[PDB]
Write the structure tokens for this entry.
Amino acid sequence: YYKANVAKAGLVDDFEKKFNALKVPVPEDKYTAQVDAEEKEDVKSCAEWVSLS
Amino acid sequence: MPQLNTTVWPTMITPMLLTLFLITQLKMLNTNYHLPPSPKPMKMKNYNKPW
């Protein structure tokens, strides 16, 4: 619908080329590792208290 | 009155002092009333979980 219905000089074609090879930024976690560390610390404290109990 | 014959007065005084000040008191000391067996079902020095 944009090859056979756009009578302009390659603008659709260069748009499709620029889009086929776009690197859209995938966001990184940067927050799950520290809550995993916090879960480890909390499990440590809880097991200590449970041995006391 | 035989109560006025002061010759037998020690015989009546010496055992009394043993009976009133030693023997009856040693038998009252062995008469003890322990405090009631009141059992507190509310005694728990607890604390919130580790958080």
Remarks:
- Chain B touches chain A at residues 49-51 (CB under 8 Å).
